[PDB]
Design an enzyme around this catalytic site. Sequence first.
Site, PDB file in Angstrom:
ATOM      1  CB  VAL A 157      -0.926   0.019   1.219  1.00  0.00           C
ATOM      2  CG1 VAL A 157      -1.726   1.349   1.269  1.00  0.00           C
ATOM      3  CG2 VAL A 157      -1.852  -1.186   1.203  1.00  0.00           C
TER       4      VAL A 157
ATOM      5  CB  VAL B 223      -1.080  -1.967   5.906  1.00  0.00           C
ATOM      6  CG1 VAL B 223       0.294  -2.454   6.370  1.00  0.00           C
ATOM      7  CG2 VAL B 223      -0.950  -0.732   5.021  1.00  0.00           C
TER       8      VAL B 223
ATOM      9  CG  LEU C 112      -9.765 -14.774  14.267  1.00  0.00           C
ATOM     10  CD1 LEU C 112     -10.737 -14.156  15.309  1.00  0.00           C
ATOM     11  CD2 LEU C 112     -10.453 -15.955  13.509  1.00  0.00           C
TER      12      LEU C 112
ATOM     13  CG  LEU D 227     -16.887 -14.930  18.170  1.00  0.00           C
ATOM     14  CD1 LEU D 227     -15.738 -14.156  18.813  1.00  0.00           C
ATOM     15  CD2 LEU D 227     -17.232 -14.407  16.820  1.00  0.00           C
TER      16      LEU D 227
ATOM     17  CB  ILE E 274     -14.822 -17.898  21.645  1.00  0.00           C
ATOM     18  CG1 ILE E 274     -13.728 -17.506  20.646  1.00  0.00           C
ATOM     19  CG2 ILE E 274     -14.615 -17.205  22.982  1.00  0.00           C
ATOM     20  CD1 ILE E 274     -12.338 -18.089  20.948  1.00  0.00           C
TER      21      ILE E 274
HETATM   22  C1  LIG Z   1      -7.054 -11.340  16.354  1.00  0.00           C
HETATM   23  C2  LIG Z   1      -7.665 -12.499  17.069  1.00  0.00           C
HETATM   24  N1  LIG Z   1      -8.621 -12.231  17.983  1.00  0.00           N
HETATM   25  C3  LIG Z   1      -9.151 -13.291  18.608  1.00  0.00           C
HETATM   26  C4  LIG Z   1      -8.785 -14.598  18.364  1.00  0.00           C
HETATM   27  C5  LIG Z   1      -9.407 -15.735  19.141  1.00  0.00           C
HETATM   28  N2  LIG Z   1     -10.228 -16.655  18.316  1.00  0.00           N
HETATM   29  C6  LIG Z   1      -9.790 -17.818  17.861  1.00  0.00           C
HETATM   30  S1  LIG Z   1     -10.959 -18.641  16.977  1.00  0.00           S
HETATM   31  C7  LIG Z   1     -12.111 -17.377  17.236  1.00  0.00           C
HETATM   32  C8  LIG Z   1     -13.492 -17.463  16.642  1.00  0.00           C
HETATM   33  C9  LIG Z   1     -13.449 -17.836  15.177  1.00  0.00           C
HETATM   34  O1  LIG Z   1     -14.797 -17.934  14.650  1.00  0.00           O
HETATM   35  P1  LIG Z   1     -15.108 -18.381  13.160  1.00  0.00           P
HETATM   36  O2  LIG Z   1     -13.957 -17.931  12.300  1.00  0.00           O
HETATM   37  O3  LIG Z   1     -16.516 -18.063  12.818  1.00  0.00           O
HETATM   38  O4  LIG Z   1     -14.999 -19.949  13.360  1.00  0.00           O
HETATM   39  P2  LIG Z   1     -15.783 -21.087  14.132  1.00  0.00           P
HETATM   40  O5  LIG Z   1     -14.934 -21.366  15.364  1.00  0.00           O
HETATM   41  O6  LIG Z   1     -17.155 -20.590  14.476  1.00  0.00           O
HETATM   42  O7  LIG Z   1     -15.809 -22.268  13.151  1.00  0.00           O
HETATM   43  C10 LIG Z   1     -11.559 -16.376  17.982  1.00  0.00           C
HETATM   44  C11 LIG Z   1     -12.211 -15.109  18.417  1.00  0.00           C
HETATM   45  C12 LIG Z   1      -7.741 -14.771  17.396  1.00  0.00           C
HETATM   46  N3  LIG Z   1      -7.260 -15.980  17.068  1.00  0.00           N
HETATM   47  N4  LIG Z   1      -7.212 -13.713  16.751  1.00  0.00           N
HETATM   48  C1  LIG Z   2      -2.375   2.048   7.215  1.00  0.00           C
HETATM   49  C2  LIG Z   2      -2.107   3.162   6.259  1.00  0.00           C
HETATM   50  N1  LIG Z   2      -1.519   2.846   5.085  1.00  0.00           N
HETATM   51  C3  LIG Z   2      -1.292   3.866   4.247  1.00  0.00           C
HETATM   52  C4  LIG Z   2      -1.627   5.177   4.513  1.00  0.00           C
HETATM   53  C5  LIG Z   2      -1.301   6.275   3.528  1.00  0.00           C
HETATM   54  N2  LIG Z   2      -2.492   6.933   2.937  1.00  0.00           N
HETATM   55  C6  LIG Z   2      -2.975   8.090   3.361  1.00  0.00           C
HETATM   56  S1  LIG Z   2      -4.317   8.585   2.479  1.00  0.00           S
HETATM   57  C7  LIG Z   2      -4.230   7.183   1.471  1.00  0.00           C
HETATM   58  C8  LIG Z   2      -5.245   6.956   0.381  1.00  0.00           C
HETATM   59  C9  LIG Z   2      -6.658   7.150   0.882  1.00  0.00           C
HETATM   60  O1  LIG Z   2      -7.601   6.948  -0.202  1.00  0.00           O
HETATM   61  P1  LIG Z   2      -9.165   7.151  -0.031  1.00  0.00           P
HETATM   62  O2  LIG Z   2      -9.515   6.806   1.392  1.00  0.00           O
HETATM   63  O3  LIG Z   2      -9.883   6.556  -1.184  1.00  0.00           O
HETATM   64  O4  LIG Z   2      -9.215   8.727  -0.189  1.00  0.00           O
HETATM   65  P2  LIG Z   2      -8.947   9.798  -1.323  1.00  0.00           P
HETATM   66  O5  LIG Z   2      -7.574  10.366  -0.994  1.00  0.00           O
HETATM   67  O6  LIG Z   2      -8.984   9.116  -2.658  1.00  0.00           O
HETATM   68  O7  LIG Z   2     -10.071  10.828  -1.152  1.00  0.00           O
HETATM   69  C10 LIG Z   2      -3.185   6.390   1.848  1.00  0.00           C
HETATM   70  C11 LIG Z   2      -2.772   5.091   1.246  1.00  0.00           C
HETATM   71  C12 LIG Z   2      -2.220   5.410   5.798  1.00  0.00           C
HETATM   72  N3  LIG Z   2      -2.578   6.635   6.213  1.00  0.00           N
HETATM   73  N4  LIG Z   2      -2.466   4.388   6.642  1.00  0.00           N
HETATM   74 MG   LIG Z   3     -18.323 -19.151  13.203  1.00  0.00          MG
END
Ligand SMILES: Cc1ncc(C[n+]2csc(CCOP(=O)(O)OP(=O)(O)O)c2C)c(N)n1
Ligand SMILES: Cc1ncc(C[n+]2csc(CCOP(=O)(O)OP(=O)(O)O)c2C)c(N)n1
Ligand SMILES: [Mg+2]
Lengths: 594, 594, 198
Positions: free
Chosen positions: B26, B52, B422, B477, B480
């Site tokens: 990006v 990103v 996730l 979930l 969980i």
């Molecule tokens: C960023 C993040 N937050 C929380 C978790 C904890 N976590 C593991 S599995 C799960 C639920 C996943 O649900 P879904 O993808 O619908 O699958 P299901 O278990 O229902 O088949 C969560 C919250 C994680 N692994 N990563």
């Molecule tokens: C995580 C992240 N990656 C990259 C950027 C850099 N960035 C700032 S504005 C922008 C583009 C935004 O585009 P959009 O939301 O469509 O707005 P527009 O400028 O076209 O009105 C990017 C990539 C950021 N701020 N945060």
């Molecule tokens: Mg599920």
Amino acid sequence: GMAKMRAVDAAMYVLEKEGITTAFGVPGAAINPFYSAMRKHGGIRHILARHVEGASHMAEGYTRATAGNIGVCLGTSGPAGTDMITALYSASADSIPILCITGQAPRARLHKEDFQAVDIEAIAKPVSKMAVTVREAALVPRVLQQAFHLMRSGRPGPVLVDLPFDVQVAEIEFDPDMYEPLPVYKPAASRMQIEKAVEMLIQAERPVIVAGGGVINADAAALLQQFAELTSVPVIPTLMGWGCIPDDHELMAGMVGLQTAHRYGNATLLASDMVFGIGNRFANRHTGSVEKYTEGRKIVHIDIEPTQIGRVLCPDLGIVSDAKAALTLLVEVAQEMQKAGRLPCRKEWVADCQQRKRTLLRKTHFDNVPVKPQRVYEEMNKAFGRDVCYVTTIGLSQIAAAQMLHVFKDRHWINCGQAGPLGWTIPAALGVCAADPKRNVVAISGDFDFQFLIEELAVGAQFNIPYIHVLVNNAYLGLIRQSQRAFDLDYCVQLAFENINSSEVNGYGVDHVKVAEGLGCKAIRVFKPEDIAPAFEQAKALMAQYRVPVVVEVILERVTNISMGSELDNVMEFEDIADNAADAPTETCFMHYE
Amino acid sequence: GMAKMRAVDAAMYVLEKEGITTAFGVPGAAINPFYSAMRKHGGIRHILARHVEGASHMAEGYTRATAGNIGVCLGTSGPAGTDMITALYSASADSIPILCITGQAPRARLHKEDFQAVDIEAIAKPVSKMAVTVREAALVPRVLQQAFHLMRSGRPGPVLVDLPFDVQVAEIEFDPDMYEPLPVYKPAASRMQIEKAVEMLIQAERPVIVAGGGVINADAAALLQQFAELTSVPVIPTLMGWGCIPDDHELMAGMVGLQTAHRYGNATLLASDMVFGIGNRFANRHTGSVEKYTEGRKIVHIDIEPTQIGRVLCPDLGIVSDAKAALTLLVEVAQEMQKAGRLPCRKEWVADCQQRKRTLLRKTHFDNVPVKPQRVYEEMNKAFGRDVCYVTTIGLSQIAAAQMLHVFKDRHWINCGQAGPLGWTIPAALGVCAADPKRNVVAISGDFDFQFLIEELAVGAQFNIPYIHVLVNNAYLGLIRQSQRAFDLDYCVQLAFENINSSEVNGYGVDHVKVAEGLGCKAIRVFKPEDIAPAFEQAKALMAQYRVPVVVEVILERVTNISMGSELDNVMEFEDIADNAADAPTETCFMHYE
Amino acid sequence: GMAKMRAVDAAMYVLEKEGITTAFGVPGAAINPFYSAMRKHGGIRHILARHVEGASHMAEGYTRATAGNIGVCLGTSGPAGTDMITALYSASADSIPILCITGQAPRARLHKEDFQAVDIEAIAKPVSKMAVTVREAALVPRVLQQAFHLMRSGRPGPVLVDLPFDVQVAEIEFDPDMYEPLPVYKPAASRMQIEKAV
Ligand SMILES: Cc1ncc(C[n+]2csc(CCOP(=O)(O)OP(=O)(O)O)c2C)c(N)n1
Ligand SMILES: Cc1ncc(C[n+]2csc(CCOP(=O)(O)OP(=O)(O)O)c2C)c(N)n1
Ligand SMILES: [Mg+2]
Ligand SMILES: Cc1cc2nc3c(=O)[nH]c(=O)nc-3n(C[C@H](O)[C@H](O)[C@H](O)COP(=O)(O)OP(=O)(O)OC[C@H]3O[C@@H](n4cnc5c(N)ncnc54)[C@H](O)[C@@H]3O)c2cc1C
Ligand SMILES: Cc1cc2nc3c(=O)[nH]c(=O)nc-3n(C[C@H](O)[C@H](O)[C@H](O)COP(=O)(O)OP(=O)(O)OC[C@H]3O[C@@H](n4cnc5c(N)ncnc54)[C@H](O)[C@@H]3O)c2cc1C
Ligand SMILES: COC1=C(OC)C(=O)C(C)=CC1=O
Ligand SMILES: COC1=C(OC)C(=O)C(C)=CC1=O
Ligand SMILES: COC1=C(OC)C(=O)C(C)=CC1=O
Ligand SMILES: COC1=C(OC)C(=O)C(C)=CC1=O
Ligand SMILES: [Mg+2]
Ligand SMILES: [Mg+2]
């Protein structure tokens, strides 16, 4: 009174005593004991996010919506904590707190390679005021007690608390009746400091006050306006101070900077001979080169944080103080100077500033098809009331919005000004609505920002959290396209494709009406500028009727270069300027807001 | 030869010499000079992500797809770098490299508070083998040269390189013809070590080989299979070693552990008297309590990393070695022992293991409406060929998939086993497809994982990257919910709501067919188990015809408890077990795969 | 052959196989099991310093005197390790190794403000190629094995190994006959580069 309970049960009493009523989160096995204590306790409304990053930005919107709020973000161990780093950075960067709470592997396995165990304390240290793994169950209430003191004291910032699973379930003896929040630390200016600042203000012939986010952080907007009125000194809010004096106030002189700034604001700053800075820092996109910003000007800087004073430019007078304490004393001393007949009359300088505000404009009233973005903001000023609360992040969408929308109360411009993480806008708006269900919340996103965390719209649908989202779609990363002009490039910034399910989007790529509807929300697409105002009226009706987010997508021309430059005296005007109301009809000089 | 060029132009030659052909990213203003050098150079295909975090997980999928690949992730300063932390953690955790490249504010403003300047070096240090802000333009090629050495040497891991804007555009003199990659460091076992291990193997009466991700990391799967065949020793792959011997090989004894494991695998491990560990570590979800796992068993552990040996349990023999060097020597010594007549016959023990594999099964053939998830995996085994490459993350969706799907080649199970973030699944699958357009990629997600980074489907639509995504939707979930049974809770884990645009989803909440179609992909919803197989056949046709991702959403019953426990001898079977082929028809004992 | 011994006894076999014959130090209660292992194993000449900083600079001079030498500096927990930072910095800065070994409080008490317990790992990290608290008794030989690889490989530098008292005295199974030092990593110029230089 005193009883044996799990450490997480004690945590629930502490959070209640500290004023917490809301939490945003994603549960997991390592944080289940905390969720179980939250269920048993009651009184915290939990909102389930559809990305841990979404929950952490909802907590930011909740904090920013109302003075004294502290948004809470909950997650499991491992990748949940690493998904909170962007929000901790964004909150640190803007001097506002959130409290992140993560589960952790049990203490005996922290240096084994336990499933999803990560050294979150070390990762989060540079973007928080405290990041600690709690090592004893009896320390859980004390770490939270210290966390709340840190989140409210000095320069505010976020805290991450990391809870090993065995620490959470371990028993302690705890007496909720005996728990008390710690006192908040805030330094206060002395009368000797403030009298010197007022003496310097009286000597200046063309002063301006630059009112920063610190004024809003201190809940001091009414005092800021009162001090400007007593001294008759024009006010320039920073992007983070915007709203601390109403945009139609006769002393509101516009905003200053390289991008989110007005032509009259920059011209007024460069004509001034003193900058009286209250609760600002001197951000590089606000100043340009500091040498040009300070030329011919005395600088006063009042900041709660000693090491913010002199960090980027050397003030003539730097004062360490909370902005409310400082403004309380500035009002008293100004009133004493008024009774003594020592405040100078400032009618000429105020008249020169108002004359710039009336003539140095940018065109908004475009009839073009495809739509020009600046017409969208003119219609937003007409459609929404004086009490509108805008939420936005970054992009040409956000920069032009800051140039052309108007705001009338503090905390009605909610914007992550220093970190600008894409995807912030939807979760932050949901967090503002959770803080205040009566708030008239309107978000602004470009298409790329809208896509990052688009699934959070389903949070608004599942929990019936209504607000209006204005989506301005150019099928571009528009700000990056514009910055690529310096490299004679237009490279890797286009989002357009022929959508095989929607020939009606005409090669713009994603069909946001279909996506928003699949996520349970309402949506309206607008192609012609005269259909924008009716679409805002339908969106209000759809919102009252279904109580979900309503997306209004405006199809823009692909390429619009927004005004910006690298110095205050060098902002280039690509699109038409204006010096008459007909081209810029929603300036406050021309239009009554409510 | 030698010429003056920008430091980023030299970086392009270095990346080309190091074998880079693809990047996911990006752009933003602070990294524009690098994008401009990438455009001028040609030969790197850039794929624009819609988060990103999506780009960083595409880079992981690209690395994991093929030995020697290094996925590259590009971003601007500030929040882009903080959005990469989860992927750096996931790659570190699994011992695989990605190269993240971020822009940065110019060096003179790093300690001022420049817009979007963040101390990414400190944030990323705990989840990378190197995280460095490059301080001189001449060091840009040397930092990349060291980065590639680190990503390939020892225990592999990720590197973050942070590039100040002024460092990127500054001129250097650079000669691409003189640039050479550094040698890769890999320790090798000596013959004295390997002969001792084979002597111990010969003495064991019921040995098993536990083949870990290190075998796949070393590209040594063919040698691993050859060594097992020469010694006639059954092989248990870890979840990260799965595929290093085909699932229908007579010596493949099943998987072991608390969750992604077979009843026959656990029973075979507990009956064994030696674990010959190659390229594994002894992960807690694989072992349970180490005391029970090692009871009555000699342990051998071969690992490339000295401080992995003895970290969680003390082996009887620990050997520091690259797995390919070790297996080359193990094959030679086993062949010498075969010529001398010293390898024991193992027909009884192999027969006992195969008998367990034939009888200790779990039911998959369910006719129920709403659908039972285990029937989905039976249909996937029948619909897809032997060359299928599965991509998945975490959830009951993933755990049951690992219990019931079959894989036949290394790097056909792509899974973030230690960190489990996730939202990983869609971007990782796109990264695998970018590494190998001929790969037959099939992803598995639950509904919640699918939602986190759902917008990445539009990356597959914009760039025409086809694969099939199996979505199993319980509006929960689910993992969980199951772990909350210990707290007699069902709290904050439901995703269901009455969708105001789709009464046909019947209160399941998000309408994924509508969302996927708005993002430019194709989608099919399945309610009845007999419609799963035809839906997989339509999805293949839609994929050939439109060349975009095709989502097959299966509506599941809300609640299914998947088999799991806290020890190898305690895995609880909630759903029906089976001891006959009719209930479990796709076990390799019963079904020919291609 | 394989035998049951304390982790510090296995460390003595590792130091012998890696060529250590000499050590400079100041004993203390937290490092006594290591001194007890050194006494029982024999074969390391110990020189008692009259300042821990003196022992750490003796180790530097011993390293610098002769190619392949690695000076070893021993101290107890707390201020002994902080007494060693200046030598670790001096050794890093000149690209030469010393091996510092400190005693430490037992693992269960590392976050409890136990007497003379300090986070020497974080303090020494800026001035060493590796600075590590050993968390398992079985890891003691492996940490020392990685240390000697790092002190000899690439740009050389010093290593600090911090030993919790309970880790030092715990029994492990270790076979001195099977221990082998790791290969040393040294990159080499190709002929193409050297011909250009000439
Ligand atoms: C960023 C993040 N937050 C929380 C978790 C904890 N976590 C593991 S599995 C799960 C639920 C996943 O649900 P879904 O993808 O619908 O699958 P299901 O278990 O229902 O088949 C969560 C919250 C994680 N692994 N990563
Ligand atoms: C995580 C992240 N990656 C990259 C950027 C850099 N960035 C700032 S504005 C922008 C583009 C935004 O585009 P959009 O939301 O469509 O707005 P527009 O400028 O076209 O009105 C990017 C990539 C950021 N701020 N945060
Ligand atoms: Mg599920
Ligand atoms: C694309 C983009 C363009 C932008 N363009 C501009 C532009 O043209 N102009 C512009 O001005 N901004 C612009 N911004 C915003 C800019 O980056 C900064 O966020 C903003 O200028 C900082 O405002 P501030 O000085 O009030 O600082 P803040 O971050 O709000 O903080 C100011 C100070 O308040 C102090 N403080 C905290 N609490 C208290 C208290 N109780 N009492 C006293 N002090 C306290 C803190 O210590 C800090 O030093 C832009 C942002 C983006 C994303
Ligand atoms: C919900 C869930 C459930 C799970 N359930 C189970 C389960 O029941 N059973 C199970 O086994 N796993 C399970 N896993 C996966 C588990 O967490 C681990 O990821 C996995 O067991 C680790 O496999 P491994 O030992 O091969 O280790 P890896 O992480 O693959 O690494 C092993 C070793 O390889 C070494 N190495 C690297 N390169 C080389 C080389 N060239 N030569 C030699 N060595 C090298 C590294 O130093 C490392 O020590 C589950 C994961 C999840 C998310
Ligand atoms: C903006 O989208 C992009 C393409 O399509 C226009 C490309 O062909 C390439 C190589 C990169 C890109 O970002
Ligand atoms: C008369 O009220 C008005 C002002 O305040 C005096 C102004 O400053 C401007 C610019 C317009 C106006 O109508
Ligand atoms: C699972 O979704 C949730 C609700 O709706 C069922 C609630 O009412 C509350 C309070 C939390 C929640 O997570
Ligand atoms: C005859 O081929 C077969 C095997 O290999 C001998 C087996 O191990 C099993 C379990 C089934 C089978 O058909
Ligand atoms: Mg998303
Ligand atoms: Mg756009």
